[PDB]
Amino acid sequence: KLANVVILATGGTIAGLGVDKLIAGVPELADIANVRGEQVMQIASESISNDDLLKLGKRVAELAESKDVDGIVITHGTDTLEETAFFLNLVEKTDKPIVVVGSMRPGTAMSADGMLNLYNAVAVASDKQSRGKGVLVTMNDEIQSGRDVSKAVNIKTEAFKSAWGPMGMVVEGKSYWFRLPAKRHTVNSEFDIKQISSLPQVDIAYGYGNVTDTAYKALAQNGAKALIHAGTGNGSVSSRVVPALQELRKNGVQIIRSSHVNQGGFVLRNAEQPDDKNDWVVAHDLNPQKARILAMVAMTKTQDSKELQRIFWEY
Amino acid sequence: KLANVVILATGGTIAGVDKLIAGVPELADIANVRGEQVMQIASESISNDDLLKLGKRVAELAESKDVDGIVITHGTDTLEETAFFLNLVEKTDKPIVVVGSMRPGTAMSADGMLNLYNAVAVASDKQSRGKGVLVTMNDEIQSGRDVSKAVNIKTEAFKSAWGPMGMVVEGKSYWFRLPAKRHTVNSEFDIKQISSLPQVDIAYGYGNVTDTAYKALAQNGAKALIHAGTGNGSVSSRVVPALQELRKNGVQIIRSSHVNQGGFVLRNAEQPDDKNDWVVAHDLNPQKARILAMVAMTKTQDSKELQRIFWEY
Amino acid sequence: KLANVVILATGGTIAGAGASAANSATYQAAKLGVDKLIAGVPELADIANVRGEQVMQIASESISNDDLLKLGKRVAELAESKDVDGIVITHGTDTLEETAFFLNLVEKTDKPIVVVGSMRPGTAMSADGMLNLYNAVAVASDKQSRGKGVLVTMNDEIQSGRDVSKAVNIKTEAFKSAWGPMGMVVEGKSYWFRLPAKRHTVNSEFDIKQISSLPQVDIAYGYGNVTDTAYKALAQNGAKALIHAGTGNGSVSSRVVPALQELRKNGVQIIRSSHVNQGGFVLRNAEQPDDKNDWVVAHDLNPQKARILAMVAMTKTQDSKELQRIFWEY
Amino acid sequence: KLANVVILATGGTIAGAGASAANSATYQAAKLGVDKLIAGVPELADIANVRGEQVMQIASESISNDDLLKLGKRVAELAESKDVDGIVITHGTDTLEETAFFLNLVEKTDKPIVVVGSMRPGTAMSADGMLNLYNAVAVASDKQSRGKGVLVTMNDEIQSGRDVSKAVNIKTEAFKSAWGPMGMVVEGKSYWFRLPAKRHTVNSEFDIKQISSLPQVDIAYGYGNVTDTAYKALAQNGAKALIHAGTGNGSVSSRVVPALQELRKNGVQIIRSSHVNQGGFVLRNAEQPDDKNDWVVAHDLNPQKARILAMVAMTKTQDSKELQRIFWEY
Ligand SMILES: N[C@@H](CCC(=O)O)C(=O)O
Ligand SMILES: N[C@@H](CCC(=O)O)C(=O)O
Ligand SMILES: N[C@@H](CCC(=O)O)C(=O)O
Ligand SMILES: N[C@@H](CCC(=O)O)C(=O)O
């Protein structure tokens, strides 16, 4: 008796309803699982919204809770795949496999990667080995953690990378594992989608030579409840920007120091800025867009900067 | 006989210039070195005025017959931006090397001593002539054009998608690739003709992003905006209208990305650049693309010329 | 208060010395005693109660199986002591990976074991060993390191002793794993991101207490126009297993397959590894009919790693099916 | 209006076939002829005037020196023809990197030569060969490819044939260079970022037109507890050079040095490479006294690459100092 896998489609070039086309076009899935599909949205992923994430997250929770669902696959555009994957990893309190998957090459193109990617995603979602591992991403014959995998290379099929390595590989339908997650996720998370009805607004500003405070102030004036600073180096802040950040913090905007140095390492508390004195937070190893996701989720529960720091150290 | 190398210090934790030099007595074996303190900043705080001053000084020194090569000691946070700028604007074949250290020189196992030795070694080497600006960290010879700070904390921080061009070991340089892109002597740009740098700013793309940062940055003076998009410089549907509006208002729109380990942003792929009169940044990360756009806008505001530039440099 | 950490010195560049500070590459390995190595890092005393022993003083390219056993037995004796909280081995980098894996297989302890070396001698400008040794002692003293298997702490990284390997020459980032670092160590603090998945230490079926002498295992290389000569000669001179370092997915030339069949028939185990070592793994029954031939694939393990696992496994079994299970579990 | 490109087929996974679409890894190589390869990509007509020839039909792990010569001589004949603008070779991935370096050394032409394979057979879901082949033909037809040396065009990359290696098993990103890709090929279009520094093709001192049969060169591996047995056996059975695939910086065990000294004195060249293949290079006089012993270091070249260069080099010289020059220039 094969596993029952539900594919929740959101758009992207992997659809080459989109979900019906996939289920019709990859008849090999039937070898490895009983598939059914639902079109949760039809979007280019760069245009995803928080309302989209909530709808998706709620749906995945409903399915996870059903006795007739064994694993879930989410098909997605590649641009913000990493953000959805981390979101789900924080809010879905389930041990059932959840896999997110896309295609780097346009789905109808010569040698396009999506077909095998989707076959692998359904394989992984149907595998007992996937239970309790958090959200997974299955691109380039790899099993990557949805927490810290990122789109790192443009164009190429090897696009999705993590500083901490792949956890496994998927080959001819079989999963081979080499590492386990360390960080908090899914059933061991403090967050639960079932209790989240809205998400706070979080925005991201970049650091670079000759940067001013303008983007920071403007983003806050248009509703940001936290600012993810994408700094140079070790979350460094220009001396022209620090005063604004102090003022914004006082005004109640959380200040989270991430970086655009995203192949490896992490941002160290109290190294480049006096985070304790200013009541700021460091994003640890998390890239800016990952940091935004964590901040948003966390701020559904707490606005205590020390708790936020704990969170950024545990997830 | 030894090369005449000048060390231009600008700051960073590799750090005065006289201390740096005194800290590596071994420099004397490989070159005749002199020092000048151009500035003393944390490189995250660098300004365009600082870049202009450094660039002009490097050109003045490169014109001297008493100078064979130039090492610039720098904070690592915007090293990559400085190195690229110099690669664009200095029309000299003399070696120009930019160097820093990921650990403080007071730290255990600090990397700066040997970095600085190697920079001086590369700056004195005939093989370095005509190679464009070089960066010499982690025993590598990296191109200033496309090396970037990619790993935090670790001494292997500076990486290029196109690989190291060479290595430096026990003072000797070993080359394996050559640059392909326009630089230094073959640049159309010259610091000696630049007295002003146009304001260029950068905005980030992510889920649920709005047009707010872009509009605000333009309102506060940006002549070009570098879009650090998701994926292949992709732009949210919520942002496209503002970008069109800002282009008609005269702001150049340059599509870069935060996908920085390899590949490049393809024209007309994710957005209709010809129709909108936008530019793609090719392989250049956002902070690199800013540098190029600012230099290029000293000379042209033609988006087609700008695109050429982004495909040649 | 402070952890009691023992440093077992074995040689290497970390104990090396060059003629000048510029000699980061041309120098003499394995010159300095352990007490001198401890004295070069006064800061160790802040983070642990340390003491040293000189187990051996070798250039690691010249290590022997007897040296592995010696080291492995002393580590066991220390791990069984109430007075020892963690152990650091200083080692040459050339075969560091082989030793670290060996210890991960045979040391049935959850006490931290850390193997460390350096790419530059301590005499050199910007020498890396001071910080490497500090970080080693930090990791060895940290409760987070318990039950994690053998660790390697070079270049600010916590790597698994299983699958870290020397991958880059000259540079201080020399040690890499296909599956990533598991963590980092920065201002002596350990930050974890991944856990091991493979069997090690406490959960291993193997124990250095049982091993009296290791079986002879040798390695032969695959390349264009390769013949069966090296395989045959190595078996004629005592190899009980051959590790084939093939091209591609452990591929075997048609010129070589017949010899390997005959060797297997004559009781020599035949293990297919590769010289394609940045990622992936060797898949059973893909390039060659391993079930027909009664051969074993080395999975992700590089040739020199495969050799260590082969030797440890052959102390318990001569059944190729079991050997394959072992190559899939460890 | 279109460039004339000749495809020379030699076998490989690119020409392979498995039983079902999901057989991406377990299949038969070297089953399809060139005509069918070309038929599988009708889009080639858009970009070039292509003709195909079947040179051989092999799994590339079983390649011989005879086969390289045969291929190299056919490539030369085509290069000399006015009716040929560029050349593509389809090849198994396992020794692709050996062939591509060989060709880089011996083909005295600026006309583009591209070597290409695939990691999955054409029958597989998401098979990589079609686009690889398309992109090879595009690069072979591009004026920007002239004078660049032999190129390899897999995974949307333009890699130098000198120093690209098969580094990752299973995945389509198999081929890597320590020195980076030189460019990318996308929508048929080539995008260059680096140029070669090393000697190649028209600037080579070697020429396939002079080579009648290649010297025998073999490879032996370094690891813990290694002996001199492989080196001596290989030499006894005809090796005119030995490639030492050392640990670390081409390091040699003290149990092996005496045999290598004896062999060099008996006329066998001794080349120190390594199995540390992601970066760096082997430094002369560092780990061994090369000048004293009259040995050669392979610089950054991996063992199988060093074997190729040594074979070519030895068609011209037996002077170890000239061989060292060659290892420093090519
Ligand atoms: N921007 C598109 C690209 C196509 C794709 O990756 O699916 C997306 O993210 O939806
Ligand atoms: N943020 C400091 C760090 C110190 C350094 O890298 O030198 C700078 O870039 O100047
Ligand atoms: N080959 C020597 C020195 C190399 C090193 O330790 O880095 C050894 O492995 O002991
Ligand atoms: N081992 C075969 C198939 C592997 C491949 O081509 O990818 C060969 O090298 O010909």
Coordinates of all heavy atoms in Angstrom, one line a residue, chain A residues 60-97:
Chain A
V60 N -1.8 23.5 4.6 CA -0.9 22.5 5.0 C -1.2 21.9 6.4 O -1.2 20.7 6.6 CB 0.6 23.0 5.0 CG1 1.5 22.0 5.7 CG2 1.1 23.3 3.6
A61 N -1.6 22.7 7.3 CA -2.0 22.3 8.7 C -3.2 21.3 8.6 O -3.2 20.4 9.3 CB -2.3 23.4 9.6
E62 N -4.2 21.7 7.8 CA -5.4 20.9 7.7 C -5.1 19.5 7.1 O -5.6 18.5 7.6 CB -6.4 21.6 6.8 CG -7.1 22.7 7.4 CD -8.2 23.3 6.5 OE1 -7.8 23.7 5.5 OE2 -9.4 23.4 6.9
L63 N -4.2 19.5 6.1 CA -3.9 18.3 5.5 C -3.1 17.4 6.4 O -3.2 16.2 6.5 CB -3.2 18.6 4.1 CG -4.2 19.2 3.1 CD1 -3.5 20.0 1.9 CD2 -5.1 18.2 2.4
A64 N -2.2 18.0 7.2 CA -1.3 17.3 8.1 C -2.1 16.6 9.2 O -1.7 15.5 9.6 CB -0.3 18.2 8.7
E65 N -3.1 17.2 9.6 CA -4.0 16.7 10.5 C -4.9 15.5 10.0 O -5.5 14.8 10.9 CB -4.9 17.8 11.0 CG -4.3 18.8 12.0 CD -5.4 19.9 12.3 OE1 -6.1 20.4 11.3 OE2 -5.6 20.1 13.5
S66 N -5.1 15.3 8.7 CA -5.9 14.2 8.1 C -5.2 12.8 8.1 O -4.1 12.7 7.6 CB -6.1 14.6 6.6 OG -7.0 13.7 5.9
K67 N -6.0 11.8 8.5 CA -5.5 10.4 8.4 C -5.2 9.9 7.0 O -4.5 9.0 6.8 CB -6.5 9.5 9.1 CG -6.9 9.8 10.5 CD -5.7 9.8 11.5 CE -6.1 10.2 12.9 NZ -7.3 9.4 13.4
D68 N -5.8 10.6 6.0 CA -5.7 10.2 4.7 C -4.6 10.9 3.9 O -4.4 10.7 2.7 CB -7.0 10.5 3.9 CG -8.2 9.7 4.6 OD1 -8.0 8.6 5.2 OD2 -9.3 10.3 4.4
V69 N -3.7 11.6 4.7 CA -2.5 12.3 4.1 C -1.3 11.7 4.8 O -1.3 11.9 6.1 CB -2.6 13.8 4.2 CG1 -1.4 14.5 3.6 CG2 -3.9 14.3 3.5
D70 N -0.4 11.2 4.1 CA 0.9 10.7 4.6 C 2.1 11.7 4.5 O 2.9 11.7 5.3 CB 1.3 9.5 3.9 CG 0.3 8.3 4.3 OD1 -0.1 8.2 5.5 OD2 0.0 7.5 3.4
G71 N 2.1 12.5 3.4 CA 3.1 13.5 3.2 C 2.6 14.6 2.2 O 1.6 14.3 1.5
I72 N 3.2 15.7 2.2 CA 2.8 16.9 1.5 C 4.0 17.4 0.6 O 5.1 17.6 1.1 CB 2.3 18.0 2.4 CG1 1.1 17.4 3.3 CG2 1.9 19.2 1.7 CD1 0.9 18.1 4.6
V73 N 3.7 17.7 -0.6 CA 4.6 18.4 -1.5 C 4.0 19.7 -1.9 O 2.9 19.8 -2.3 CB 4.9 17.5 -2.8 CG1 5.6 18.3 -3.9 CG2 5.6 16.2 -2.4
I74 N 4.9 20.8 -1.9 CA 4.5 22.1 -2.3 C 5.3 22.4 -3.5 O 6.5 22.5 -3.4 CB 4.7 23.2 -1.1 CG1 3.9 22.8 0.2 CG2 4.3 24.5 -1.6 CD1 4.5 21.9 1.1
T75 N 4.7 22.6 -4.7 CA 5.4 23.1 -5.9 C 5.4 24.6 -5.9 O 4.3 25.3 -5.6 CB 4.8 22.5 -7.2 OG1 3.4 22.7 -7.2 CG2 5.0 21.0 -7.1
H76 N 6.5 25.3 -6.3 CA 6.7 26.7 -6.0 C 7.7 27.3 -6.9 O 8.6 26.6 -7.4 CB 7.2 26.8 -4.5 CG 7.0 28.0 -3.7 ND1 7.8 29.2 -3.9 CD2 6.2 28.3 -2.7 CE1 7.5 30.1 -3.0 NE2 6.5 29.6 -2.2
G77 N 7.5 28.6 -7.1 CA 8.6 29.3 -7.9 C 9.8 29.3 -7.1 O 9.8 29.3 -5.8
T78 N 10.9 29.4 -7.8 CA 12.2 29.3 -7.1 C 12.6 30.6 -6.3 O 13.3 30.5 -5.3 CB 13.4 28.8 -7.9 OG1 13.6 29.7 -9.0 CG2 13.1 27.4 -8.4
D79 N 12.1 31.8 -6.8 CA 12.6 33.0 -6.2 C 12.5 33.1 -4.7 O 13.4 33.6 -4.0 CB 12.0 34.2 -6.9 CG 12.5 34.3 -8.4 OD1 13.3 33.5 -8.8 OD2 12.1 35.2 -9.0
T80 N 11.3 32.7 -4.2 CA 11.0 32.9 -2.7 C 10.7 31.5 -2.1 O 10.2 31.4 -0.9 CB 9.9 33.9 -2.3 OG1 8.6 33.4 -2.8 CG2 10.2 35.3 -2.9
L81 N 11.1 30.4 -2.8 CA 10.9 29.1 -2.3 C 11.5 28.9 -0.9 O 10.9 28.3 0.0 CB 11.6 28.2 -3.3 CG 11.4 26.6 -3.1 CD1 11.6 25.8 -4.3 CD2 12.2 26.0 -2.0
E82 N 12.7 29.6 -0.7 CA 13.4 29.4 0.6 C 12.7 30.1 1.7 O 12.9 29.7 2.9 CB 14.8 30.0 0.5 CG 14.9 31.6 0.4 CD 16.2 32.1 -0.1 OE1 16.4 31.9 -1.3 OE2 17.0 32.5 0.8
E83 N 11.9 31.1 1.5 CA 11.2 31.8 2.5 C 9.9 31.0 2.9 O 9.7 30.8 4.1 CB 10.7 33.2 1.9 CG 11.9 34.1 1.4 CD 11.5 35.5 0.8 OE1 10.5 36.1 1.2 OE2 12.2 36.0 -0.1
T84 N 9.2 30.4 1.9 CA 8.1 29.6 2.2 C 8.5 28.4 3.0 O 7.9 28.0 4.0 CB 7.3 29.2 0.9 OG1 6.7 30.4 0.4 CG2 6.2 28.1 1.2
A85 N 9.6 27.8 2.6 CA 10.1 26.6 3.2 C 10.4 26.8 4.7 O 10.1 26.0 5.5 CB 11.3 26.0 2.5
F86 N 11.0 27.9 5.0 CA 11.4 28.2 6.4 C 10.1 28.5 7.2 O 10.0 28.1 8.3 CB 12.4 29.4 6.4 CG 12.9 29.7 7.8 CD1 13.2 28.8 8.8 CD2 13.4 31.0 8.1 CE1 13.8 29.1 9.9 CE2 14.0 31.3 9.3 CZ 14.2 30.3 10.2
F87 N 9.2 29.3 6.6 CA 8.0 29.6 7.2 C 7.3 28.3 7.7 O 6.9 28.2 8.9 CB 7.1 30.4 6.2 CG 5.7 30.8 6.8 CD1 5.6 31.7 7.8 CD2 4.6 30.2 6.4 CE1 4.4 32.1 8.3 CE2 3.3 30.5 6.9 CZ 3.2 31.4 7.8
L88 N 7.1 27.4 6.8 CA 6.4 26.2 7.1 C 7.2 25.4 8.2 O 6.6 24.7 9.1 CB 6.2 25.3 5.9 CG 5.3 26.0 4.8 CD1 5.2 25.0 3.7 CD2 3.9 26.2 5.4
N89 N 8.5 25.5 8.2 CA 9.4 24.8 9.1 C 9.1 25.4 10.5 O 9.3 24.7 11.5 CB 10.9 24.9 8.8 CG 11.7 23.9 9.3 OD1 11.4 22.7 9.3 ND2 12.8 24.3 10.0
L90 N 8.7 26.6 10.7 CA 8.4 27.3 12.0 C 7.0 27.1 12.5 O 6.8 27.0 13.7 CB 8.7 28.8 11.8 CG 10.1 29.1 11.4 CD1 10.1 30.6 11.1 CD2 11.1 28.8 12.5
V91 N 6.0 26.9 11.6 CA 4.7 27.0 12.0 C 3.9 25.7 11.9 O 2.7 25.6 12.4 CB 3.9 28.2 11.3 CG1 4.6 29.5 11.6 CG2 3.7 28.0 9.8
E92 N 4.4 24.7 11.3 CA 3.6 23.4 11.0 C 4.1 22.4 12.1 O 5.1 21.8 12.0 CB 3.9 22.8 9.6 CG 3.4 23.8 8.6 CD 1.9 24.1 8.5 OE1 1.1 23.3 9.0 OE2 1.6 25.1 7.7
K93 N 3.2 22.2 13.1 CA 3.5 21.3 14.2 C 3.1 19.9 13.8 O 2.0 19.4 14.2 CB 3.0 21.8 15.6 CG 3.7 23.0 16.0 CD 3.4 23.4 17.4 CE 4.1 22.5 18.4 NZ 4.4 23.1 19.7
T94 N 3.9 19.3 13.0 CA 3.6 17.9 12.4 C 4.9 17.2 12.1 O 5.9 17.9 11.7 CB 2.8 17.9 11.1 OG1 2.6 16.5 10.7 CG2 3.4 18.7 10.0
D95 N 5.0 15.9 12.3 CA 6.1 15.1 11.9 C 5.9 14.6 10.5 O 6.8 13.9 10.0 CB 6.5 14.1 12.9 CG 5.5 13.1 13.2 OD1 4.3 13.1 12.6 OD2 5.8 12.2 14.1
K96 N 4.7 14.8 9.8 CA 4.5 14.3 8.5 C 5.5 15.0 7.6 O 5.7 16.2 7.8 CB 3.1 14.4 8.0 CG 2.2 13.5 8.8 CD 0.7 13.6 8.3 CE -0.2 12.8 9.1 NZ -1.5 12.9 8.5
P97 N 6.0 14.3 6.6 CA 6.9 15.0 5.6 C 6.3 16.2 4.9 O 5.2 16.0 4.4 CB 7.3 13.9 4.7 CG 7.3 12.7 5.6 CD 6.0 12.9 6.3

